[PDB]
Enzyme design. Structure first.
Site, PDB file in Angstrom:
ATOM      1  CD  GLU A 115      22.388 -91.030 -65.062  1.00  0.00           C
ATOM      2  OE1 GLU A 115      21.731 -91.991 -65.528  1.00  0.00           O
ATOM      3  OE2 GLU A 115      22.540 -89.965 -65.689  1.00  0.00           O
ATOM      4  CD  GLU A 120      20.894 -96.697 -67.898  1.00  0.00           C
ATOM      5  OE1 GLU A 120      20.633 -96.309 -66.740  1.00  0.00           O
ATOM      6  OE2 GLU A 120      21.161 -95.910 -68.839  1.00  0.00           O
TER       7      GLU A 120
END
Length: 297
Positions: A115, A120
């Site tokens: 990914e 994040e």
């Protein structure tokens, strides 16, 4: 150069994503809901300025054995394959105990196809963490053409669970990002590399503003994922994802370490659930406000 593929804002933006409404793959204390439920409970709306709001339940007190606090996870219907992605984001979930927001990309399976994590972080984090996870052996080696700081250089799942991680600069995440009006996150994806930039509000390249992006004026990437493998060949066409989960694998396990988050129960995960369940008002700032998403080929 690049041609505009999709230009997404407002209702058109919402129409371009499916709403993931199953149990959280990251095991969070979250209750992902459908679009009609989210709109009815005020978690999703188009604002008067034309931006899209994606928020969470910041009203209700919850059982510790509830599924979790309500939120949404949007996954694009159309996939991206190389090119540029430009996201103008006014607000992201804040530096808040329990929170785990992400703007990222995924293939048809997870986590074992790898990914790209563009935005994040967890809990009261203040600087962005950009992460790639790859199937193949990939060491990133461009820490000297990058403003961020590489904290882990091996991307492969086989090499370890951390992936290759680059820490962003001040103001690039959470509460610090929000108080300056957010900015633009940009990704350039080629066979050889994935480059990520963050441009603070009022410091966005004019070619981005004009929808005719010139990567040369982007300057030095914040994260330069380039090295011992062709990084961009590690990924099949990807769905773009915006979500906010709570606790779970990452946020729940590191909760309470150097983050000012209170430890009230038998371990960090249980303490995380306690905070998220019992302090709904603390999550008023746990929302995305997205101005637009534009893709180029």
């Amino acid at each position: 150069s690049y041609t505009l593929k999709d230009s997404l804002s407002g209702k058109d933006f919402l129409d371009a994503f499916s709403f993931f409404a199953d149990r959280d793959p990251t095991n969070g204390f979250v209750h992902y809901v459908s679009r009609e439920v989210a709109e009815g409970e005020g978690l999703v709306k188009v604002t008067s300025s034309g931006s899209v709001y994606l928020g969470v339940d910041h009203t209700n007190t919850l059982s510790l054995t509830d599924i979790g606090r309500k939120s949404v996870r949007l996954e694009s219907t159309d996939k991206i394959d190389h090119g540029l992605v430009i996201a103008d984001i006014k607000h992201m979930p804040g530096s808040i105990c329990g929170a785990w927001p992400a703007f990222w990309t995924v293939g048809d399976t997870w986590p074992d196809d790898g990914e790209i994590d563009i935005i994040e972080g967890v809990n009261t984090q203040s600087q962005n963490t950009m992460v790639l996870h790859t199937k193949g052996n990939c060491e990133i080696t461009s820490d000297d053409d990058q403003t961020g700081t590489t904290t882990s250089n091996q991307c492969s799942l086989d090499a370890g669970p951390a992936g290759c991680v680059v820490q962003g600069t001040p103001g690039s995440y959470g509460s610090s990002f929000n108080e300056q009006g957010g900015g633009v996150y940009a990704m350039q994806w080629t066979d050889e590399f994935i480059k990520l930039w963050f441009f603070p509000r009022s410091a966005i390249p004019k070619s981005i503003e004009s929808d005719s992006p010139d990567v040369s004026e982007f300057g030095t990437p914040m994260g330069n994922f380039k090295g011992t493998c062709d990084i961009g060949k590690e990924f099949k066409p990807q769905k773009l994802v915006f979500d906010t989960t709570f606790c779970g694998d990452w946020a729940g396990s590191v909760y309470g370490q150097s983050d000012s988050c209170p430890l009230t129960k038998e371990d960090s995960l249980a303490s995380c659930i306690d905070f998220v369940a019992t302090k709904p008002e603390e999550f008023k700032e746990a929302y995305w406000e997205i101005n637009y998403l534009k893709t180029y080929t």
